């Protein structure tokens, strides 16, 4: 029984699974987890990059000494839940503390052969269609004292985001309550009398200062400024559909559940928080935090 890195297999190409799984709590066992050095995140990042490359493969043609853009059937449905599964000689430990911060000892640890159905959703700033936290909202970071270290936020009440083509719609009441919850959670870690400020991303490139995602085969970039303009009838976010063009090859509506956020802290008596992150390893890490791989 020791920590190890190995290639998990996948299940729903991937192998069948779950006509009847089995979770099993290991009694009297406490296990140390570290969501920030979990090689499952690296494996899933690589798998998602390969998934996108393979989805782009049928849009090229190898005619002569080059690859040319070609047919491309647009509606390429990507997100179906996948499960990562330990191979022979290994086992996946799963934390069950509903408020686990990701870095520390879990007192209620079960053992599994496969993870839950994880939806590979590529999105920025907002985490959509993910898992929810029981009871309380959770905030997780390697080092809260260290700004520019991404802050992963898991809610307990999801927020419906209904987008059409081109804008998105969020209820002001639900989002107001969500922001209040996040503000109190941040006050817990940064100071009680400290005031929380939500402001727009502090970058410049319009590709990262927006909430971007895939809405029915087309990629949307939405100005999310109306969500981060607060200090502690219906919000319509303006959006633009951008076409992905691969540089080196020669020549509508959807509803989602907002289940998480990615924030970055500034760096007085207050604290400014801005939507950040961008790296998708934090997107996958927001779901693989309560797992680890061990060798028996």
């Amino acid at each position: 029984w020791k920590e190890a890195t190995t290639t998990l297999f996948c299940a729903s190409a991937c192998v069948p699974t779950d006509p009847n799984p089995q979770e099993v709590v290991l009694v009297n066992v406490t296990e140390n987890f570290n969501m920030w050095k979990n090689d499952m995140v690296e494996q899933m990042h690589e798998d998602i990059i390969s998934l996108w490359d393979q989805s782009l493969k049928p849009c090229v043609k190898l005619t002569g000494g080059s690859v040319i853009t070609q047919a491309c059937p647009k509606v390429s449905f990507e997100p179906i839940p996948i499960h990562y599964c330990a191979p022979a000689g290994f086992a996946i430990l799963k934390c069950n503390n509903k408020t686990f911060n990701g870095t520390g000892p879990c007192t209620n640890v079960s053992t599994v052969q496969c993870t839950h159905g994880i939806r590979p959703v590529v999105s920025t700033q907002l985490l959509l269609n993910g898992s929810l936290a029981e009871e309380e909202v959770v905030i997780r970071s390697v080092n809260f004292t260290d700004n520019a270290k991404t802050i992963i936020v898991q809610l307990n009440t999801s927020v419906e985001i209904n987008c059409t083509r081109a804008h998105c719609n969020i209820s002001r009441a639900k989002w107001n309550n969500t922001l209040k919850q996040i503000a109190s959670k941040l006050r817990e870690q940064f100071g009680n009398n400290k005031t929380i400020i939500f402001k727009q991303s502090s970058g410049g490139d319009p590709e990262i200062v927006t909430h971007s995602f895939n809405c029915g085969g087309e990629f949307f970039y939405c100005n999310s400024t109306q969500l981060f303009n607060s200090t502690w009838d219906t919000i319509t976010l303006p959006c633009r559909i951008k076409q992905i063009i691969n540089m080196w090859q020669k020549v509508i509506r959807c509803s989602s559940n907002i289940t998480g956020l990615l924030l970055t802290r500034d760096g007085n008596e207050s604290e400014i928080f801005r939507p950040g992150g961008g790296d998708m390893r934090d997107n996958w890490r927001s779901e693989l935090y309560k797992y680890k791989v061990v060798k028996i």
Epitope: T124, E207, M247, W248, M280
Partner: nanobody, 118 residues
Framework: AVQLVDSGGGLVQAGGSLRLSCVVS????????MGWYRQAPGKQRDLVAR???????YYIDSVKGRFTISRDNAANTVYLQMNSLKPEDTAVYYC????????????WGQGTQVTVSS
């Protein structure tokens, strides 16, 4: 996978010009956006410029008017022409490429050192 090679950096004087090159190799037909970051010892990263598949570009305000990012298809290269160079441009520059449809970059080079004196 993808391999990026940065080159071009060196010593010049204030008001001189440089041309950084990022050569691209491997499974490159999934890149939809490349760019140049720069970092000086003791400071945070800085996305200075980026080009996308549709040839649209972005530059930070500090380099708007002095820097130009462009693409050489016949050479699989991305060029960053730096003009009116100022001492505030001294850093290690890395070229980066994105192989996911959105998000931050996925592939990075080894970096090249740009220094300028006054």
């Amino acid at each position: 996978a993808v391999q990026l090679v940065d080159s071009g950096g060196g010593l010049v004087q204030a008001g001189g010009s440089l041309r950084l090159s990022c050569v691209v190799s491997g499974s490159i037909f999934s890149i939809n956006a490349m760019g140049w970051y720069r970092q000086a010892p003791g400071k945070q990263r800085d996305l200075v410029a980026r080009i996308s598949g549709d040839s649209s570009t972005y530059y930070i305000d500090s380099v708007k008017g002095r820097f130009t990012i462009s693409r050489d298809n016949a050479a699989n290269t991305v060029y960053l022409q730096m003009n009116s160079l100022k001492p505030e441009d001294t850093a290690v520059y890395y070229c980066a490429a994105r192989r996911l449809p959105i998000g931050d970059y996925t592939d990075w080079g080894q970096g090249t050192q740009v220094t300028v004196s006054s």
